[PDB]
Design a protein around this nucleic acid. Structure first.
Ligand SMILES: [Zn+2]
Lengths: 56, 114, 123, 122, 207
RNA sequence: GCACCUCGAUGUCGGCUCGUCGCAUCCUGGGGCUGUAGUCGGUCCCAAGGGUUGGGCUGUUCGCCCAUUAAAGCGGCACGCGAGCUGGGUUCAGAACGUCGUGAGACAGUUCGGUCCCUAUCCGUCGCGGGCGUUGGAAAUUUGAGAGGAGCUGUCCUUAGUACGAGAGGACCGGGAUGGACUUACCGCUGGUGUACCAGUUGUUCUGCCAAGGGCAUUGCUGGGUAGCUAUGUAGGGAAGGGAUAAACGCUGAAAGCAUCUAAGUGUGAAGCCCACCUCAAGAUGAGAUUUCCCAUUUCUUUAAGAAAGUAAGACCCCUGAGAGAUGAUCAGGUAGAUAGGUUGGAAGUGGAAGGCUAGUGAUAGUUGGAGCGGACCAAUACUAAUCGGUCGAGGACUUAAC
RNA sequence: UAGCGAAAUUCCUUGUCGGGUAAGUUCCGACCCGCACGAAAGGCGUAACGAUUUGGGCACUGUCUCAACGAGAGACUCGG
RNA sequence: CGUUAAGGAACUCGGCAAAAUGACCCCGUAACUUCGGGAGAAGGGGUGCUGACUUCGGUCAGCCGCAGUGAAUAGGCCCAA
RNA sequence: GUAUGAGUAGCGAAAGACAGGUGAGAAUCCUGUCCACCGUAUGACUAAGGUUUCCUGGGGAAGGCUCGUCCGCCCAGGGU
RNA sequence: UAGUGAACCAGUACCGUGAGGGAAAGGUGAAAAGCACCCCGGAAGGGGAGUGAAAUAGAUCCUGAAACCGUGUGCCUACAA
């Protein structure tokens, strides 16, 4: 159909309380202590389970 | 499957010969007509098996007085006296449904003496 | 299963990716493609243990015919053809290994589409 | 599975060959029928002569559908055609002979004069 | 009264002793620990808490162990009740074996149905189609929402929302075998439940 | 009938999907009277719980007709329902017949053909999540304030050829068996689908060739088919009872020495009301009940139900998943391991692999051999992947009475 | 006048009889009482022809009784 | 877009849409008529591979499959107004 | 000039996958390999019509329905 | 947004085969003295240091209202038509 009215400034914001970006698990490494993702290959470290994996 | 094939090792029948689909078979039934107990006789061609253990079934085709009659039996009934394998035939299909539109002398099966 | 595309296109996809790793032993792709390549590669190394004619004549499905891989000469130019590599190298590598010939590692999302990406290796 | 406007056959000496159904008597909206039920019907082909002609409201009884019956044993019957026998409301056939096999389950509903005239009761 | 929980295994066929095929469900049990006794002076009831399986001891909490510890057993998964039983005859820690349903044979069976997701308004309620040809455009839709005059929609004009996942009894079923060595009751018919789910089995109500 | 209402536009009839309400009731249920012997009936009172059919004829309403049934109700809801469908009908531009008109044209006269646009903002209705409260923090189990569902019915046997009647015919109240329509769950049987399962087979092209195979031709076409999802398949349901009533019938008894169901008193009495059966249910802010688990640093704002930080019991994030799923949720697991993949075996299913030998001039046939293959199904097995981790989360107010 | 005639014309009208169907106001054959057919704004037959209008049979079938399953695109989740 | 048990126009204003026929070769073919037509009227039979013999077309013998223009393309018919 | 609708509808019929380059940055640019589509045309030559889009070397603010180190786009030379 | 349509490279760009129709667009500072040099970044863009009486006069460059979009905070808000 066609919207009947202008929605006010209040119901702009009362929708958008579920329009967020959130960040999931951030572990710290072993070889550098740097904040990186759980279960993921540590990119700057190049290690995972203490192994030169991304090498080659 | 673990418990079921332990619960039904008991009502099975071991009296059953070996037969492929496409083998002429006599089947003794058991018919209750009030208090009587007749033993009928059916002769046809085996077409099916429904392989499942407890509840395997098979089929038979008469052609009697023009009309063809089909009857499916389960295996493990006590209301079947015997199963008499009569012939053996060249078949290459597991389920012979193409018999449907055939009439008489174009629905014959061959004989292998085995 | 995992539907990805139409019917015959999955056969094309998995013949593409699993005739790779026979040659390179590393592959960088997405997540779900890696899981289908798990299953199909490990089904096609157990034929590398047998060495029969049925080992060859069932490898006529998931092997691209004219695909080379050369680290080889004596005084010649002599060419392994990426199925010969199964029946001469990867068989005797995992002659004593049971199932589970692969690794899948989780690196990064792709820049173009935010598709998370994945490394496959063998040992 | 026999409904309105479905063609049966006749297995009698009563000069009819085929039949349409009209109704499926007994109930207030019954859809289907099986072996051993009563049909209101008409006569749409006829051998010449005979007692029963075209255009007649005729009751009949179903023998040998192409989808037979479970029995309490566990066995089934599947015939190949559809046939019927004409009845004078006494459960007594008009014609003399009956051709072809006949299912057993007419005995459960007192069709004894039909059953004792069949060549075979299956 | 007679109440036993348990699993759900499958479907078989059993010849009876006059030679008749009958479809049969396969329901297990185990020994069955009574956990509490609820009386009028404490809860205003008369009821009994029962429980059927063995968890690992990794998979529970301290309060679950504090419930279990008055009966000296393993911590369990499923815990339910039973109302309207003349008690006596029940202590904290007894076992209710499979033997209670020898040929009681008049039994209500409860479970939970399967789950089928979002589906159309046909597959719940059996509302029929519209015509698929002669030029229409109304194949598989849920009707009209009502009249005009009340300027709203009356409640319960049922529409598309998730199929299955609620608990359903079936009344007056029979019992065929009781296998005490294997803890299996066999029942004629069909039971609402997916495999491995719970089933409560009680003596029936309507005599 | 009137012309208040809508002309910067409030779209007709029938049919389809979906219903809901009223009772001046069509069937089933309880009754009074009869010019009611019996089975049938006629009339009137109570009663809305459920049910109320398929086809032929025009566009139909309306109606006529066939075959059934316990019955084939009357009405309201914009003569219910077109931002849900149809557009046949009546109301566009073409053309024709009859009639009228000198004529252009016209006719509730007829005949063929002729366009139905919309991405749902707000309320509404169906399903499903996040936040907070429930006065310390938690894990489970649960009365039921209220609400929703279901509510129909035929035929046969037996009392009994009995009571009734000249015969003709032929019961009430009871007991039992078995169907129709509707509806709740399920895949063991019968069947359907089953596009990463098995085989046959045509054309062309490719892997150098013979042999063996891949691509494409609607999945190439054809013959079968596991799990899963399914009905026309299976199993079950409406039972038996209770309390207060409706119409109707009394018992006792007077006002009125009698009579009389009523004013006092005291009963019988229906598919209807409230229970009885199935389900939802403490956001029932009147926020319920039980079981089990957990016990304390700093500065002062000065001790006020103060702030702040580490924790317990426990939960979450992240990861492997399906008996779950639009997403989130639910549920099975996370090395105290069988959660998924693989491996070794099976099973359903297909129906005799390759290679070699034998017989054939060949097309082919026989044997090695119930062979070879095997998507979801069943056991076993840490081989691969659930590494290492991080975040949140209590220290329990007052008044009175009782000991 | 001949020739037609409840018709692309007929209000009353679903005129009356016959045929076709279990049941046929639509169709075909006949009657004449043509509200208001008629001879070049032509009358009455007609082989062949027609993306023409109308009535009826065979074969076929998810149009239907009464639906069920599978494939692809959209729809749904995340990035632009 | 693909498949379907049993029934086969009951749906509907109306068989609208789908389904069914479809290639080559042989037999056979009505009423009616303006004699040219109707007429591909209707209704039926055959088709693969191997060997032998082919005057030429083909003929005979054998083998296999449910199915031999094995895929794609390729007319539904009749009765009346 | 700026809102609402709303970060919604849409992104204009098709088959891609990997390795190695270059680069601040890569599914989208280059190279290799195999796979796939048309093939009385999605192949070759020309008549109008368009008017420098053609070639060589550089660039990424805007155009390209996303991205872009690339282009029928921008800068500078040069060819008929 | 006045005054010619046009204070600016205007009957121009743009539209219609054609006759024809026809816009928008003024302002740094007194003087260009229009930010040497360092720092992050591929750049764009910014932060220092300078020029200038003034840089919130930095080339979209005098003053800079309203709708509209944001940040921070004194008080209120989860039984309410
Ligand atoms: Zn690290």
């Amino acid at each position: 159909a066609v919207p009947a009215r202008r929605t006010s400034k209040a119901k702009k914001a009362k929708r958008r309380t579920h329009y967020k970006l959130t960040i999931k698990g951030l572990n710290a490494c072993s070889n550098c202590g740097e904040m990186k993702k759980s279960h993921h290959v540590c990119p700057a470290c190049g290690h995972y389970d203490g192994k030169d994996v991304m090498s080659k | 499957n673990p418990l079921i094939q332990e619960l039904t090792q008991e009502q099975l029948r071991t009296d059953i010969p070996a037969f492929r689909p496409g083998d002429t078979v006599r089947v003794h039934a058991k018919v209750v007509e009030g208090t009587r107990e007749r033993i009928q006789l059916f002769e046809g061609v085996v077409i099916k098996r429904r392989g499942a253990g407890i509840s395997e079934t098979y089929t038979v085709r008469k052609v009697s007085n023009g009309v063809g009659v089909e009857r499916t039996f389960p295996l493990h009934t006590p209301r079947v006296a015997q199963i008499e394998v009569v012939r053996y035939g060249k078949v290459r299909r597991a389920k012979l449904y193409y018999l449907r539109a055939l009439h008489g002398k174009a629905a014959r099966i061959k004989e292998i003496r085995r | 299963r995992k539907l990805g595309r139409t019917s015959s296109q999955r056969k094309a996809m998995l013949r593409d990716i699993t005739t790779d790793l026979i040659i390179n032993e590393r592959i960088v792709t997405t997540e779900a493609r890696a899981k289908e390549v798990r299953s199909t590669v490990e089904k096609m190394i157990t034929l590398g243990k047998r060495g029969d004619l049925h080992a060859r004549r069932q490898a006529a499905t998931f092997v691209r015919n004219e695909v080379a891989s050369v680290r080889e000469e004596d005084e010649s130019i002599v060419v392994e053809s990426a199925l010969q590599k199964l029946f001469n190298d990867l068989g005797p590598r995992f002659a004593e290994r049971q199932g589970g010939y692969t690794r899948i590692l989780k690196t990064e999302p792709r820049r173009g589409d935010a598709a998370p990406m994945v490394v496959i290796e063998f040992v | 599975m026999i409904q309105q406007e479905s063609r049966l056959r006749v297995a009698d000496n009563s000069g009819a060959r085929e039949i349409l159904t009209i109704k499926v008597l007994g109930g207030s909206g019954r859809k289907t029928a099986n072996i051993g039920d009563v049909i209101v019907a008409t006569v749409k082909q006829a051998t010449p002569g005979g007692v029963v002609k075209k255009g007649e409201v005729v009751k009949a009884v179903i023998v040998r559908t192409k989808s037979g019956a479970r029995r309490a044993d566990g066995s089934y019957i599947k015939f190949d055609e559809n046939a019927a026998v004409i009845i004078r409301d006494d459960k007594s056939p008009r014609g003399t002979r009956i051709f072809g096999p006949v299912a057993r389950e007419l005995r459960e509903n007192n069709f004894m004069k039909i059953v004792s005239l069949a060549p075979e009761v299956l | 009264t007679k109440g036993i929980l348990g699993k759900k295994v499958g479907m078989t066929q059993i010849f009876t002793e006059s030679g008749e095929l009958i479809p049969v469900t396969v329901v297990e049990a185990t020994p069955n620990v009574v956990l509490q006794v609820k009386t009028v002076e404490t809860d205003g009831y008369e009821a009994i808490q029962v429980g059927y399986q063995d968890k690992r001891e990794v998979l529970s909490n301290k309060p679950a162990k504090g419930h279990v510890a008055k009966a000296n057993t393993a911590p369990k998964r499923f815990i339910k009740e039973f109302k309207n039983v003349e008690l006596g005859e029940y202590e904290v820690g007894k076992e209710i074996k499979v033997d209670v349903f020898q040929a009681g044979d008049v039994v209500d069976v409860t479970g939970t149905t399967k789950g089928k997701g979002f589906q159309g308004a046909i597959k719940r309620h059996g509302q029929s189609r519209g015509p698929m040809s002669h030029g229409s455009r109304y194949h598989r839709r849920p009707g009209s929402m009502g009249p005009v005059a009340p300027n709203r929609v009356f409640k319960n004009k049922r529409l598309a929302g998730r199929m299955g996942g609620d608990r359903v009894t079936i009344q007056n079923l029979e019992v065929v075998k009781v296998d005490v060595e294997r803890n299996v009751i066999l029942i004629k018919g069909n039971i609402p439940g997916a495999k491995k789910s719970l089933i409560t089995i009680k003596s029936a109500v309507k005599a």
